[PDB]
Amino acid sequence: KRVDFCGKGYHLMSFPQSAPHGVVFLHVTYVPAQEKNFTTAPAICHDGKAHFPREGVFVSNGTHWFVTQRNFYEPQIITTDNTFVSGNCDVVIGIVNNTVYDPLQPELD
C-alpha cells in the first residue's frame, strides 16, 4: 500500500527474474485515464435531515444527482441504503436540496 515503493501508480503484482549478479522485478501497475469533470456537493438534506455517503461521492451531470466511487465512474441512484443521516442541514456548508428515494414505500404498494 505504500506509495511509489514498487511501481508507479497503484500496485497489482510483481514477477522476479534472475540476472548475472542481481535481480530484476517486473511490476504491474494500474493507471486511470479518460477523465471527466462534474459538479459535487458535500451532503444532501431531505425532509430536514442531512445525508452523507458511505463509500463514494455525490456527482451531478447538470440536472440529476448520483453517488459514484472515487476511482471509477459508474453512477447509481441515491437511496437510503448507501447513505447515512446525521443531524440537520443548518451548519454544514455547501448543502444542496434534493430528494432521496426509498424502496420500502414502492415495494409495500
Binding site: 506509495v3 452523507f52 454544514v92
Partner: protein, 49 residues
C-alpha cells in the same frame, strides 16, 4: 499516480479523516474549529522557529 484531478479542500480533508477511522461527519460539523486550530498552530511554529 497519474494526471492531476482537482478536488475541493474540504472533501480532501474529509477523505483524510475517513482514512484514519474518524467518520467524515466530524469534519463537516467542526470545520471552523479545525481551521482556527490549524491557523494558531502554523502561527506558533513561526515564533518557535
Amino acid at each position: 499516480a497519474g494526471a492531476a484531478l482537482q478536488i475541493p479542500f474540504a472533501m480532501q480533508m474529509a477523505y483524510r479523516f475517513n482514512g484514519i477511522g474518524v467518520t467524515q461527519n466530524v469534519l463537516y460539523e467542526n470545520q471552523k474549529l479545525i481551521a482556527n486550530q490549524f491557523n494558531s498552530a502554523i502561527g506558533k511554529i513561526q515564533d518557535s522557529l
